[PDB]
């Protein structure tokens, strides 16, 4: 129904976003560290809008905030895109979400795709869409239950869809950009993980330098695709070559007659397919830089210039508290 976490994500487990982490520390940690700065006519900011182009992992960042905000508990629901068979009326969920947060202070509420609460673009909505909107607004404002110790972080890729009434409840609005080259280099290395490969550190630097405007989501697609190359190469080899190479079990031990895919005519190129290679004999190649480049060349960034401009427009013609 409603997701409950106790994240242990640290600031530094979020690649790049130096500027945004600064803004969050100031919007969220500072009032917590020094609540006396925010009394009388001042108050912390109950609502923080995380906005920017897709694929930057806003949620992941939100969990970092949860973690550093005194190990707050992280609660979420996700507003909904393509699914119709679904969660129709719907209203008491908002209520239950805010209540559970109130009971588990300190806590953070995270609402993804908070825009798809405005209900719909060129649809009605207009039924429970109304009932929900006021519900949400009711919990943001506060009944007699104060929401001291609850933070609301809403995430959206399309802040202009956002209904003016929702927006105004978000007093802090923090832009999350596509990643910078060093940060992309770091995400490639990450996503690869401990998948055996032969990329040098220069290769990763290179992959960084070459992905201006790719999102972390983008990079993941490129990597997943690259990961599938040993298998692809193995299933379409028409020939294999006897070679000696390391045991899968113990790299101290060299096995003497592994079989490895190779191009049709070659020193020792025996003709056979994977259906004739014994389980214990296959030696697949490892993920290579040319593998990564191939995926890269087959994948375009998701976000274009018209998108990023449409987002600048919002930052301008609203600012914070607009």
Domain residue ranges in the chain:
1-178+302-319, 179-301
> Kindly report the CA angle at 291 between 288 and 297, in degrees rounded to 5?
145
CB 188 within 8 A of CB 292: yes
Q: Checking DSSP bridges between strand 254-261 and strand 239-246, what pairing results, if any?
A: antiparallel
Q: Which two tokens stand for residue 207?
A: 């992959």
Distance CA 115, CA 163 (A): 8
Distance CA 17, CA 26 (A): 14
Distance CA 294, CA 152 (A): 41
CB 62 within 8 A of CB 108: yes
Q: Which residues contact 132 (CB under 8 A, 6 or more apart)?
A: 90, 91, 94, 117, 119
Distance CA 127, CA 203 (A): 54
Q: Which two tokens stand for residue 32?
A: 């917590």
**Three-state DSSP class for 269?**
strand
**CATH architecture of residue range(s) 179-301:** Orthogonal Bundle (1.10)
Query: Could you tell me which residues are annotated as the binding site?
Result: 52-59
CA distances to 2, 36, 57, 59, 292 from 14, rounded to whole Å, are 24, 30, 9, 11, 23
CB 286 within 8 A of CB 198: yes
Number of neighbouring beta carbons within 10 Å of residue 27:
20
Q: Tell me which residue of 94, 91, 167 sits closest to 129, measured CA to CA.
A: 91
Q: Helix and strand tally (H, E) in the chain?
A: 12, 9
Distance CA 126, CA 236 (A): 54
What residues does 151 pair with on adjacent strands?
108
Cβ-count burial 44-66 (b if 16+ within 10 Å, e if not): bbbbbbbbbbbbbbbbebbbbbb
Q: Which residues contact 179 (CB under 8 A, 6 or more apart)?
A: 15, 16, 17, 56, 187, 214, 215, 216
Q: Tell me which residue of 31, 45, 39, 60 sits closest to 320, measured CA to CA.
A: 45
CB 268 within 8 A of CB 241: yes
Q: Which two tokens stand for residue 216?
A: 């972390």
Q: Tell me which residue of 190, 188, 145, 156 sits closest to 81, measured CA to CA.
A: 156
90: left (phi over 0), alpha (psi -120 to 50) or beta: left
What residues does 241 pair with on adjacent strands?
260, 269
Number of neighbouring beta carbons within 10 Å of residue 18:
10
CATH 3.40.50.300 given to domain 1-178+302-319 = yes
- Residue showing tokens 């707050």: 72
Q: Tell me which residue of 124, 171, 114 sits closest to 147, measured CA to CA.
A: 171
Q: Which residues contact 185 (CB under 8 A, 6 or more apart)?
A: 204, 205, 207, 208, 209
Distance CA 114, CA 132 (A): 12
**Three-state DSSP class for 256?**
strand
Cis omega (within 30 of 0) for bond into 151: no
> Kindly report the CA angle at 261 between 259 and 263, in degrees rounded to 5?
130
Query: Could you tell me which residues are annotated as the binding site for ATP?
Result: 52-59
Distance CA 160, CA 313 (A): 9
Residues in the chain: 322
Cβ-count burial 288-314 (b if 16+ within 10 Å, e if not): bbebbbebbeeeebbbeeeeeeebeeb
What residues does 47 pair with on adjacent strands?
152
Distance CA 146, CA 246 (A): 64
CB 68 within 8 A of CB 11: yes
Radius of gyration over alpha carbons of the chain, in Å?
25
Cβ-based burial of 110 (10 A; exposed 0-12, middle 13-18, buried ≥19): buried
Q: How was this structure determined?
A: X-ray
Q: Which two tokens stand for residue 277?
A: 């290679």
């Amino acid at each position: 129904a409603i997701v409950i976490e106790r994240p242990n994500v640290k600031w530094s487990d979020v690649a790049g976003l130096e500027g945004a982490k600064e803004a969050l520390k100031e919007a969220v940690i500072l009032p917590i560290k020094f609540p006396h700065l925010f009394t009388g006519k001042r108050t912390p900011w109950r609502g923080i809008l995380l906005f920017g182009p897709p694929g930057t992992g806003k949620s992941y960042l939100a969990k970092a905030v949860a973690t550093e905000a005194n190990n707050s508990t992280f609660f979420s629901i996700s507003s909904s895109d393509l699914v119709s068979k679904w969660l129709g009326e719907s209203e008491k969920l908002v209520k239950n979400l805010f209540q559970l947060a109130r009971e588990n202070k300190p806590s953070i509420i995270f609402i993804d795709e908070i825009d798809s609460l405005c209900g719909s673009r060129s649809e009605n909505e207009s039924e429970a869409a109304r009932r929900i909107k006021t519900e949400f607004l009711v919990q943001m404002q506060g009944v007699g239950v104060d929401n001291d110790g609850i933070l609301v972080l809403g995430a959206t890729n399309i802040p202009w869809v956002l209904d003016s009434a929702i927006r105004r409840r978000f007093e802090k609005r923090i832009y999350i950009p596509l990643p910078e080259p060093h940060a992309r280099a770091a995400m490639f290395k990450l996503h690869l993980g401990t998948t055996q490969n032969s990329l040098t550190e220069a290769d990763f630097r290179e992959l960084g330098r070459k992905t201006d405007g790719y999102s972390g989501a983008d990079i993941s697609i490129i990597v997943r695709d690259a990961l599938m190359q040993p298998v692809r190469k193995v299933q379409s080899a028409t020939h294999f070559k006897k070679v000696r190479g390391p045991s899968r079990a113990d790299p101290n031990h060299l096995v003497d007659d592994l079989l490895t895919p190779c191009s049709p005519g070659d020193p020792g190129a025996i003709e056979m397919t994977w259906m004739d290679v014994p389980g214990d004999k296959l030696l697949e190649p490892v993920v290579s830089m040319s593998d990564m480049l191939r995926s890269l060349s087959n994948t375009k960034p998701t976000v274009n210039e018209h998108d990023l401009l449409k987002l600048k427009k919002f930052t301008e013609d609203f600012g914070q508290e607009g």
